[PDB]
Amino acid sequence: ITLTENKRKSMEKLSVDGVISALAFDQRGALKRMMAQHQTKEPTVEQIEELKSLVSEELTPFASSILLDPEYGLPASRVRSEEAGLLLAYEKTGYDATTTSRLPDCLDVWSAKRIKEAGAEAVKFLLYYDIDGDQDVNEQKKAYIERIGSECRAEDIPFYLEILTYDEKIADNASPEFAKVKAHKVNEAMKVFSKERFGVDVLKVEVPVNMKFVEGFADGEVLFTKEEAAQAFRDQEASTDLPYIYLSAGVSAKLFQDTLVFAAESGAKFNGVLCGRATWAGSVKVYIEEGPQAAREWLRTEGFKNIDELNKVLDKTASPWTEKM
Amino acid sequence: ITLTENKRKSMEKLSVDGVISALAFDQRGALKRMMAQHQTKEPTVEQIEELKSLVSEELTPFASSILLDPEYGLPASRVRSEEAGLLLAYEKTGYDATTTSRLPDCLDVWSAKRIKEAGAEAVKFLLYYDIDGDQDVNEQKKAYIERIGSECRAEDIPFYLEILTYDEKIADNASPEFAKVKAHKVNEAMKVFSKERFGVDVLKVEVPVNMKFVEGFADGEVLFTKEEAAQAFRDQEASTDLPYIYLSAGVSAKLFQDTLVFAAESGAKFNGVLCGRATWAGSVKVYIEEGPQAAREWLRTEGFKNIDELNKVLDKTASPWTEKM
Ligand SMILES: [Ca+2]
Ligand SMILES: [Ca+2]
Ligand SMILES: [Cl-]
Incomplete structure (x- = not known):
């Protein structure tokens, strides 16, 4: 609620007129798998670092900040636009699929202090959370986030906390079964991690509905009327007093934009986005198949078009955090 | 080197006249194993927590503070004397004997915040450190301690950091081979973790020599003259500007105490001790074999004698931490 002078200066460096128009590219495992769909060989470290730098160079002139990973993203962090702020990811990528606990784990040789020393204006951490899951797992997860929030305080x-929801007993978070409980998963997790003890400054969250199953957006089965969907957005806005920003979860650029419009019309007072794949996903194929110059031209045309159309939508949908602090 | 008002106040609650005369009893597995020797059945949680409470009730009137573990020791913490402060252990016990890394790990449902909420006036963490070991292993350890120091600042x-030294290539730290390098291990590790970035308030450390190989204290081979050992203590004193206190584990009560005398004589300005095993060990056989009433009586009589002998030696050897400002 009350930012310190330094935290506020950093928030300002990440945002424009209270809106966070951030580019997300801390993907590692998720990026590798995209690359592996066009690549026979294993993608190299140089390839991963290069595409990250290419996205940074070409697109951060159009973002208020960029989120990168320390593993492959530090060269990219140094060629970002002068006007763009920096977030660094602090969690190890992915989760153990042989169990349902998805426990969080910080990068082995990092600390918040080190992230700050590396030039970041925010620490980002991704937590998988099932509000209905095992209570002892969740106790361990809450303790872990308390520690990080305390580091960031010191x-x-x-502290940007990303929450990705799941159900221990539902395999596919794109399924109709998960869509029926998503709002509960998202909004109750936001309520938990908005408690003061967790030290969060901004929540990076999913929209509380799977729009593919909403009337007017759906191409197949319809699970929700527009009014029911709108209510999920209002319930989300009522689930936190913190700034919150949306992730794209890799939907199309157009569906993400249309979702932002719907969210605003419904009453969500979201404060921006940390948007990755919806913006740059198409560069991966070009980079692998056609190389870096071709990917650079893609970024300068299609990439720009995505981020520019996104920025125009944000301009008319997002609310400033400087009305919540 | 500068304490906040609260940190200072907490330090005062852990000390008497700037000397730390703290009773260590955060043993978990080790305490269970001692008990397991004197009964057939598996020692229960009730038994373990009762013995800690007996020791706490009967001996903390004579200690400046007591170190307990959150696993078995919270009930004991609440019956400590009102004159005695509280430290709680934050680390998981032991290390993997398969590997040489001895990596640290916090207790899974704890945080510095939760340790403070449980009434502690200090967070204690044990780290195993080989200054000459794998440098990536050591970067991971250093990052880990940074996180904890940051939590405790927040x-x-x-933050009491206990360092136990070892050598990746020497199996027995009681060997002559380890004795020859112990001063190097201990003192260099103190130089590392005295750096401001680790946030340490007190170091809990080994004496920098194995007195069993020192002239006049050895009953077998002699590796060191009294003058060389004296120099090792002076090198230790010059390795930090933080308060530091000695741990025992490894030697008899009498030898530890004679070592305190030798330490002071040599020019060490150590600020106290965190030692528990020598003082209460005899109560364990008594508690299992004659019940809680007998144990209480053991603690009142033999137990008091033990801790009083120690306190009398501390009065002649330890220097105040207040002096280190
Ligand atoms: Ca609790
Ligand atoms: Ca709200
Ligand atoms: Cl133990």
């Missing part, structure tokens, strides 16, 4: 650096 | 609670 180092006086904003 | 929660405004003193």
Whole structure:
């Protein structure tokens, strides 16, 4: 609620007129798998670092900040636009699929202090959370986030907590079965991690509905009327007093934009986005198949078009965090 | 080197006249194993927590503070004397004997915040450190301690870091081979974790020599003259500007105490001790074999004698931490 002077200065460096128009590219495992769909060989470290730098160079002139990973993204962080702020990811990528606990784990040789020393204006951490899951697992997860929030307090650096929801007993979070419980998963997790003890400054969250099953957006089965969907957005806005920003979860650029419009019309007062794949996903194929110059031209044309159309939508949908602090 | 008002206040609650005369009893597996020797059945949680409470009730009137573990020791913490402060252990016990890395790990449902909420005036964490070991292993350890130091800064609670040294290639730290390098291990590790970035308020460390190989204290081979050992203590004193206190584990009560005398004589300005095993060990056989009433009587009589002998030696050897400002 009350930002320290340094935390506020950092929030300002990440945003424009209270809106976070951030580019997300801390993907590692998720990126590797995209690359592996066009590549016979294993993608190299140089390839991963290069595409990250290409996205940074070409697109951060159009974002208020960029989120990168320390593993492959530090060269990319240094060629970002002068006007763009920096977030660094702090969690190890992915989860163990042989169990349902998805426990969080910080990068082995990092700390919040180190992230700040590396030039970041925010620490980002991704937590998988099932509000209905095993209570002891969740106890361990809450303790873990308490520690990170305390680090960020001490180092006086904003804590961006990303929450990705799941159900221990539903395999596919794109299924109709998950869509029926998504709003509950998202909104109740936001309520938990908005407690003061967790030290969060900004929540990076999913929209509380799977729009593919909403009337007017759906191409197949319809699970929700527009009014029911709108209510999920209002319930989400009522689930936190913190700034919150949306992730794209890799839907099309157009569906993500249309979702932002719907969210605003419904009453969500979201404060921006940390948007990755919806913007740059198409560059992966070009980069692998046609190389870096071809990917650079893609970024300068299609990439720009995506981020520019996104920015125009944000301009008319997002609300400033400087009305919540 | 500068304490906040709360950190200072907490340090004062852990000390008497700037000397730490703290009773260590955060043993978990080790305490269970001692008990397992004197009965057939598996020692229960009730038994373990009762013995900690007996020791706490009967001996903390004579200690400046007591170190307990959150696993078995919270009930004991609440019956400590009102004159005695509280430290709680934050680390998981032991290390994997398969590997040489001895990596640290916090207790899974704890945080510095939760340790403070449980009434502690300090967070205690044990780290195993080989200054000459794998440098990536050591970067991971250093990052880990940075996180903990940052938590404790945020929660405004003193951070007591215990360092136990080892060598990746020497199996027995009682060997002559380890004795020859112990001063190097201990003192260099103190130089590392005295750096401001680790946030340490008090170091809990080994004496920098194995007195069993020192002239006049050895009953077998002599590796060191009294003058060389004296120099090792002075090198230790010059390895940090933080308060530091000695741990025992490894030697008899009498030898530890004679070592305190030798330490002071040599020019060490150590600020106290965190030692528990020598003082209460005899109560364990008594508690299992004659019940809680007998144990209480053991603690009142033999137990008091033990801790009083130690306190009398501390009065002649330890220097105040207040002096280190
Ligand atoms: Ca609790
Ligand atoms: Ca709200
Ligand atoms: Cl133990």
